[PDB]
Amino acid sequence: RLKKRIFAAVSEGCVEELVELLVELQELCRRRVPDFLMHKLTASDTGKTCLMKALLNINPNTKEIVRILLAFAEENDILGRFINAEYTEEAYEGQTALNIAIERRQGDIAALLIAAGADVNAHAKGAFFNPKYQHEGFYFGETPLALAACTNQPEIVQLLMEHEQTDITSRDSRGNNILHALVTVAEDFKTQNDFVKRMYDMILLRSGNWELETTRNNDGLTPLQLAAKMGKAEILKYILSREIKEKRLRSLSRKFTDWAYGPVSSSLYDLTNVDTTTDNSVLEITVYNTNIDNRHEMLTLEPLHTLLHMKWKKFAKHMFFLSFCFYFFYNITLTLVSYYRPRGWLQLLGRMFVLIWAMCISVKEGIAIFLLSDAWFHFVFFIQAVLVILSVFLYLFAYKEYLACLVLAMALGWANMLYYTRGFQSMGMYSVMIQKVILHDVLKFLFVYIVFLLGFGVALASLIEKCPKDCSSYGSFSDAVLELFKLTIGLGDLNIQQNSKYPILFLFLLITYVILTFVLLLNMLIALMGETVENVSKESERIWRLQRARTILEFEKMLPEWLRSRFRMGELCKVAEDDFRLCLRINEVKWTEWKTHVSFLNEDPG
Amino acid sequence: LIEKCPKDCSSYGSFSDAVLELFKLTIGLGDLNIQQNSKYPILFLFLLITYVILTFVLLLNMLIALMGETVEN
Amino acid sequence: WAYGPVSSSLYDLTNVDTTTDNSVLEITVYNTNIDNRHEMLTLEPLHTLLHMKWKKFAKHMFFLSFCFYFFYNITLTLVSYYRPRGWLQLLGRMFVLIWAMCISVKEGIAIFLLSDAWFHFVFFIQAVLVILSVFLYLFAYKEYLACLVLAMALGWANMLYYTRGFQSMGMYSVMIQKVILHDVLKFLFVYIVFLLGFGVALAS
Amino acid sequence: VSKESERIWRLQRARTILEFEKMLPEWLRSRFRMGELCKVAEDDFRLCLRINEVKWTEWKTHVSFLNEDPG
Ligand SMILES: COc1ncnc(OC)c1C(=O)Nc1nc(C(F)(F)F)c(-c2ccnc(C(C)(C)C#N)c2)s1
Ligand SMILES: COc1ncnc(OC)c1C(=O)Nc1nc(C(F)(F)F)c(-c2ccnc(C(C)(C)C#N)c2)s1
């Protein structure tokens, strides 16, 4: 039991003399060699060495325990397999002692380890360290450097990165390198105090080149595209607007001031993986990707806001107005064909226009539907166009029901103009408010009102006798239901001689319906709408801006290659010794932060 | 949706009277007959109920809520 | 086992988990002489106990209870509507009778052992109206229809109880209840004073 | 009431949960019985209820644990 005695005296550490006696025992025994010396100091189940066991359980004397441990392992010249050992369990695989010393924040022990040959490129290629479900697993990046950086140990990060054998460019099993990992664990300032932006800057500058920021994980995302997918708007704003004054590190920036004078400064933001000219850009991801709902803040970041405004004012404003004009005349032709139906040259042109515009919307929103609240509008545009072409089909046959589909298509098209309200900010914010009210208030009201209307309609229809003579408005369930609805909208009259056999119960139930709807439900709808309207007013400009951004990017994808290349925001800019990357000037004015400007590329401010 | 009757048997006959009938509904004024000489009376009733929801339930109460926001600012 | 950000605690559950007489969970959920039950429910051992109970059996017992009350109410509704002015029919009619007796004894026991119990009262009154209606119908009493329509009406009202299964609908219901108490009843009193005084004033 | 409705609903649903649990028969109550017994001290072995959690601001070397290997 010498193995278990050493294990207990090392994980407990009551004294160094206990472990010294046990180690003298093991040395005087095993020589009677390295392999089974280890087997007499190992955990043959998981592979956990007594160095691992000591590090797992740090006591006030651990830096001496582990020191005697490795000095023994070096006196027997087994140090290599000793301090570089790894777990064999399927859930902690590849975990060495250094992952332990770093997770435990034991900077001194980790320094002693890697000073004595601790393999630092060791990957925590394990189901705990590479989690699938939260709270069983901690995703940090599967390396000692990614652990030291994600657990906010800048001293251990500096100590690891200064090591000649740490491999900062190494990627984990998920494809991530240290910078993807930092982006994933980046939470917020609310829950993390924003140390990850600092570790990101430190690691990127301490490896001064683009190798880290350019690598894509197994999802095909760089740290920047990942910071956009996951809605990390702080690390994204940090990367997007990264300006390094260092002359030896001026090629690792994304935005470089080129002519600032006083209050006015003209910047030159880098637009490489940001401007919709690549596969999944930061702008495209920031506008589209809907698995976050954190697209809120990411859209006003300095290059993206100006890219969207350049796209709008270059082509998308006009494509949107042209799209609106086409939908408007399509709807007017549907309206006039419905109205002037039978109970030419410019006529037939309009009729085939609705047919072909219906087929175009059909194929477009059908393609866009199979490639899938934001797409309510794909559904209704598709359903409207389908109703139009179905109406045309039933009309070129001898089917009279073409008018049902045609009037429904006309109705739904006029509803679909709520889409085009997103061209203006006033009307667009009004529409996101209408939509929020319909979802949060009106549908809840309609459900409750229909359970009232239907229950009271059957109650009041049940109370009514059979007259031999139409002497009751509440005779059937439907007729009753009909004028409970009429009562709600205050339309007819109210006769309370309804041929009931229990007229006081009939009147009690009618008064109860009136209270429940008129007094309670409708006024409570007003109160709840007032609560919705006040909450949605604080986010409606954000939601409208996101809607218009999605529309801008939809229109940009419609353009043909020559037109997309013709528009192409951002002018190429001499930015470093030889970088010459597409950039996007954004002049700005600041009055509080006074300083002598040394960073520029044109010392003369245009 | 309304057919041609041979007799005044529909309030929604022309666009104007239909427009007048809808306006009366919003202000709560006339009666509501739903036998309007439509050929698709369930679609007529669906569209009438939809108008009532959109105006009575949504637009007028949302006007109250928006006025409440204006008045406070 | 805490590692980095993730730490796994092991809360003790000895006098906390409804397996003893008056547990901390039972007292925290029930005891109504404080109205300070606000904050206590979210405490860590307790909050996870209620969610484990919900997702282990109570979600399903609640949906099953709702389904039984719903078909009980639908049978009351259809028996009211299709009253006279079978095999699957008589099954439904005796179903309302026995479900009414079960609710009767349950909410009567729960009433004698006593705003939170509005619902005991209305569930009991509804079930009593149903069994009274059945009694008046197996006799030759025509007033069974008054009790039956009132029972149907009150049962559809009692579904506001089952709205507490979802958070959206459940919060909407506590809001409806608060509005009815704080606003609608005050309105109804004042409106009746005005309606009755002006009615006598105008009739005069 | 919007500021307290989630609290009130949660209390209502808790009362319903505890009402249903009292309806169950003894074998079903014992069958459900949240919380797994846990070696917790030298000899305590009290029923316990694991609740994993994540914290990013309070950094410290962890000395309190009973399984030094995090599952
Ligand atoms: C969700 O509600 C429903 N859903 C579908 N159908 C329904 O009825 C067909 C119902 C329903 O509420 N029925 C009712 N029964 C009764 C009872 F008289 F029996 F008490 C009701 C009543 C009685 C006395 N004062 C009220 C007020 C309005 C003051 C309150 N609060 C209501 S209301
Ligand atoms: C609790 O109130 C009641 N409850 C039961 N029955 C009632 O009356 C039958 C009443 C009641 O209000 N009676 C009233 N009498 C008079 C008076 F004209 F004689 F002065 C009233 C009056 C007079 C002048 N201007 C107002 C307005 C509306 C402008 C105001 N403010 C109200 S009001």
Side-chain angles (χ1 to χ4, degrees), chain A residues 7-10 13 18-19 33-39 41-43 45-52 54-60 62 65-66 68-73 76 78-80 82-85 87 91-102 104-107 109-124 126-129 131 137-161 163 166-187 189 191-192 195-200 202-210 212-213 215-228 230-233 235-245 248-278 280-289 292 295 298-301 303-344 347-363 365-369 371-372 375-388 390-392 394-468 471-475 477-551 553-560 562-565 567 570 572 575-576 580-586 589 591-592 594 597-602 605-606, chain B residues 1-6 9-13 15-73, chain C residues 1-20 22-31 34 37 39-43 45-86 89-105 107-111 113-114 117-130 132-134 136-204, chain D residues 1-16 18-25 27-30 32 35 37 40-41 45-51 54 56-57 59 62-66 70-71:
Chain A
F7 268 2
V10 163
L18 264 109
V19 186
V33 159
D35 285 331
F36 303 54
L37 180 123
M38 292 296 219
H39 292 153
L41 276 87
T42 194
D45 196 296
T46 242
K48 166 178 319 192
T49 304
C50 21
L51 205 75
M52 272 153 174
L55 287 164
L56 284 150
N57 318 84
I58 36 89
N59 60 352
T62 328
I65 314 172
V66 301
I68 316 163
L69 279 218
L70 42 101
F72 172 58
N76 202 210
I78 185 145
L79 196 42
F82 193 79
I83 83 174
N84 281 345
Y87 281 41
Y92 317 135
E93 180 167 22
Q95 165 171 21
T96 60
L98 197 71
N99 204 289
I100 326 194
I102 295 168
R104 302 289 195 228
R105 313 191 71 81
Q106 285 320 288
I109 316 184
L112 306 171
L113 284 168
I114 54 201
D119 164 73
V120 37
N121 318 313
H123 280 105
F128 178 66
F129 303 121
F138 168 43
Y139 182 61
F140 69 81
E142 307 188 3
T143 35
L145 186 61
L147 180 61
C150 289
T151 60
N152 193 21
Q153 280 146 65
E155 320 103 313
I156 314 199
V157 180
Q158 287 139 32
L159 164 92
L160 287 157
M161 268 188 316
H163 199 135
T166 190
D167 225 11
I168 316 178
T169 71
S170 311
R171 291 159 72 234
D172 82 30
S173 273
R174 199 193 285 197
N176 306 25
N177 53 56
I178 170 61
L179 289 192
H180 308 257
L182 283 163
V183 160
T184 81
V185 320
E187 306 293 326
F189 187 78
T191 86
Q192 257 195 2
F195 72 85
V196 181
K197 173 202 314 160
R198 241 153 36 218
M199 312 285 327
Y200 195 109
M202 176 204 322
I203 292 153
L204 185 62
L205 302 187
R206 201 78 55 108
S207 146
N209 44 315
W210 285 90
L212 282 178
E213 275 255 28
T215 52
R216 344 185 65 72
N217 56 346
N218 291 165
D219 199 296
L221 302 173
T222 50
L224 178 63
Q225 286 160 63
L226 190 62
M230 336 171 64
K232 305 311 163 35
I235 193 126
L236 186 78
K237 187 195 184 234
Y238 149 74
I239 293 157
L240 273 201
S241 64
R242 175 188 356 144
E243 171 166 9
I244 313 176
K245 265 114 284 182
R248 73 165 297 267
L249 289 168
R250 176 135 190 205
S251 65
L252 251 75
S253 303
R254 289 218 55 106
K255 142 207 180 155
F256 335 64
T257 266
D258 84 321
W259 74 242
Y261 187 78
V264 60
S265 84
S266 178
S267 320
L268 223 47
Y269 290 79
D270 188 13
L271 286 189
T272 300
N273 275 202
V274 180
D275 180 79
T276 66
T277 164
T278 41
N280 37 356
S281 331
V282 177
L283 183 57
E284 155 187 349
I285 293 175
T286 286
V287 157
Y288 272 122
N289 289 337
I292 48 147
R295 297 149 283 175
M298 308 206 299
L299 177 63
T300 32
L301 310 188
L304 305 186
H305 193 89
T306 302
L307 280 187
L308 283 168
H309 280 252
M310 281 326 153
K311 264 143 189 174
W312 186 244
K313 304 228 172 175
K314 216 170 286 178
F315 60 94
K317 199 208 251 291
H318 314 278
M319 291 180 83
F320 190 83
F321 171 73
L322 204 75
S323 178
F324 162 81
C325 267
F326 268 91
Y327 205 61
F328 191 80
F329 297 138
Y330 165 81
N331 279 153
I332 276 183
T333 308
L334 286 177
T335 298
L336 293 169
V337 155
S338 307
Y339 193 64
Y340 294 110
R341 63 158 175 110
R343 322 184 199 218
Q347 160 160 306
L348 177 63
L349 177 63
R351 287 158 181 280
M352 305 169 317
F353 162 62
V354 298
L355 176 57
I356 78 193
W357 202 242
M359 304 207 265
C360 302
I361 301 160
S362 178
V363 311
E365 322 275 357
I367 295 176
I369 271 166
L371 271 42
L372 295 174
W376 158 259
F377 277 119
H378 295 280
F379 294 143
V380 288
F381 268 98
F382 175 74
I383 285 152
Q384 201 265 1
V386 158
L387 285 164
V388 175
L390 159 65
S391 157
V392 172
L394 294 172
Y395 177 80
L396 305 158
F397 308 151
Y399 278 100
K400 274 299 174 174
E401 308 82 40
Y402 90 93
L403 182 69
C405 325
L406 168 62
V407 172
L408 264 173
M410 181 246 285
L412 200 42
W414 290 128
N416 291 345
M417 312 297 292
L418 179 81
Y419 179 88
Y420 293 99
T421 68
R422 78 194 41 198
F424 312 109
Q425 200 210 44
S426 64
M427 210 46 217
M429 290 166 65
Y430 188 65
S431 323
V432 321
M433 173 143 291
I434 285 172
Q435 290 152 206
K436 291 266 180 170
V437 163
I438 292 187
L439 305 169
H440 305 346
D441 308 309
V442 165
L443 290 180
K444 232 164 276 183
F445 170 89
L446 281 189
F447 177 68
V448 178
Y449 174 79
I450 288 160
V451 180
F452 282 148
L453 178 79
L454 294 195
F456 279 104
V458 67
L460 294 170
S462 307
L463 287 175
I464 295 313
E465 323 170 31
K466 213 177 170 172
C467 55
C471 66
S472 195
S473 288
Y474 291 79
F477 156 77
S478 61
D479 327 347
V481 156
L482 170 63
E483 63 185 342
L484 276 198
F485 168 66
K486 292 182 65 203
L487 246 164
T488 302
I489 64 175
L491 271 204
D493 224 290
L494 186 73
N495 196 17
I496 69 170
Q497 293 177 335
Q498 288 304 150
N499 191 221
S500 185
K501 62 180 68 180
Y502 308 98
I504 304 169
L505 178 64
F506 186 95
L507 188 48
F508 165 71
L509 292 178
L510 201 67
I511 298 333
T512 302
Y513 177 81
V514 171
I515 296 163
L516 286 176
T517 53
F518 183 88
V519 178
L520 167 75
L521 177 63
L522 277 158
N523 304 325
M524 205 194 134
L525 172 68
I526 305 171
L528 296 169
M529 274 180 186
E531 272 304 279
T532 305
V533 161
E534 72 151 51
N535 305 337
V536 177
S537 64
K538 290 131 62 171
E539 59 173 335
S540 56
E541 183 179 342
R542 191 217 108 207
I543 298 154
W544 163 79
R545 188 182 320 286
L546 211 33
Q547 290 177 330
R548 210 186 70 180
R550 303 185 61 116
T551 296
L553 290 208
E554 293 177 350
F555 280 136
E556 197 206 9
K557 256 168 291 217
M558 288 171 206
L559 291 182
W562 47 282
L563 258 185
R564 289 194 92 198
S565 178
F567 287 125
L572 197 147
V575 296
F580 311 121
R581 46 183 95 163
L582 291 58
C583 282
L584 177 63
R585 172 166 339 254
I586 301 166
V589 186
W591 284 104
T592 55
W594 297 107
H597 289 115
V598 191
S599 37
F600 43 82
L601 303 101
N602 287 337
Chain B
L1 287 175
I2 295 313
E3 323 170 31
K4 215 185 312 172
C5 55
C9 52
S10 195
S11 288
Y12 291 79
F15 155 78
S16 83
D17 282 322
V19 158
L20 178 68
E21 270 335 287
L22 287 192
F23 167 68
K24 293 179 179 179
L25 243 165
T26 302
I27 63 173
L29 271 204
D31 224 290
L32 186 72
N33 196 17
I34 69 170
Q35 293 177 335
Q36 288 304 150
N37 191 221
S38 185
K39 62 180 68 180
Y40 308 98
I42 304 169
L43 178 64
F44 186 95
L45 188 48
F46 165 71
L47 292 178
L48 201 67
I49 298 333
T50 302
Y51 177 81
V52 171
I53 296 163
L54 286 176
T55 53
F56 183 88
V57 178
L58 167 75
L59 177 63
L60 277 158
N61 304 325
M62 205 194 134
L63 172 68
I64 305 171
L66 296 169
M67 274 180 186
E69 272 304 279
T70 305
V71 161
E72 72 151 51
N73 305 336
Chain C
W1 74 241
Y3 187 78
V6 60
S7 85
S8 178
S9 322
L10 221 46
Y11 290 79
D12 188 13
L13 286 189
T14 300
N15 275 202
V16 180
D17 181 79
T18 66
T19 164
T20 41
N22 37 356
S23 331
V24 177
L25 183 57
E26 155 187 349
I27 293 175
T28 286
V29 157
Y30 272 122
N31 289 337
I34 48 147
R37 297 149 283 175
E39 293 177 350
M40 321 204 287
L41 230 54
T42 31
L43 307 184
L46 302 193
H47 183 95
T48 276
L49 280 187
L50 283 168
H51 280 252
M52 281 326 153
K53 264 143 189 173
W54 186 244
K55 304 228 172 175
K56 227 178 219 156
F57 60 94
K59 199 208 251 291
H60 314 278
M61 291 180 83
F62 190 83
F63 171 73
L64 204 75
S65 178
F66 162 81
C67 267
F68 268 91
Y69 205 61
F70 191 80
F71 297 138
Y72 165 81
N73 279 153
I74 276 183
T75 308
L76 286 177
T77 298
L78 293 169
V79 155
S80 307
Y81 193 64
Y82 294 109
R83 63 158 175 110
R85 322 184 199 218
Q89 160 160 306
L90 177 63
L91 177 63
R93 287 158 181 280
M94 305 169 317
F95 162 62
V96 298
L97 176 57
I98 78 193
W99 202 242
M101 304 207 265
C102 302
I103 301 160
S104 178
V105 311
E107 322 275 357
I109 295 176
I111 271 166
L113 271 42
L114 295 174
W118 158 259
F119 277 119
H120 295 280
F121 294 143
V122 288
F123 268 98
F124 175 74
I125 285 152
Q126 201 265 1
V128 158
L129 285 164
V130 175
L132 159 65
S133 157
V134 172
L136 294 172
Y137 177 80
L138 305 158
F139 308 151
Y141 278 100
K142 274 299 174 174
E143 308 82 40
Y144 90 93
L145 182 69
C147 325
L148 168 62
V149 172
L150 264 173
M152 181 246 285
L154 200 42
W156 290 128
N158 291 345
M159 312 297 292
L160 179 81
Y161 179 88
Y162 293 99
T163 68
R164 78 194 41 198
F166 312 109
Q167 200 210 44
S168 64
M169 210 46 217
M171 289 166 65
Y172 188 65
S173 323
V174 321
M175 173 143 291
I176 285 172
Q177 290 152 206
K178 291 266 180 170
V179 163
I180 292 187
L181 305 169
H182 305 346
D183 308 309
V184 165
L185 290 180
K186 232 164 276 183
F187 170 89
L188 281 189
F189 177 68
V190 178
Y191 174 79
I192 288 160
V193 172
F194 278 153
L195 183 81
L196 294 195
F198 279 104
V200 60
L202 289 176
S204 298
Chain D
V1 177
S2 64
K3 290 131 62 171
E4 59 173 335
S5 56
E6 183 179 342
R7 191 217 108 207
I8 298 155
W9 163 79
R10 188 182 320 286
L11 211 33
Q12 290 177 330
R13 210 186 71 180
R15 303 185 61 116
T16 296
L18 290 208
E19 293 177 350
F20 280 136
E21 194 205 16
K22 256 168 291 217
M23 288 171 206
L24 291 182
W27 47 282
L28 258 185
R29 289 194 92 198
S30 178
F32 287 125
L37 197 147
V40 296
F45 311 121
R46 46 183 95 163
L47 291 58
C48 283
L49 177 63
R50 172 166 340 254
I51 301 166
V54 186
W56 284 103
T57 55
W59 297 107
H62 289 115
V63 191
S64 37
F65 43 82
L66 303 101

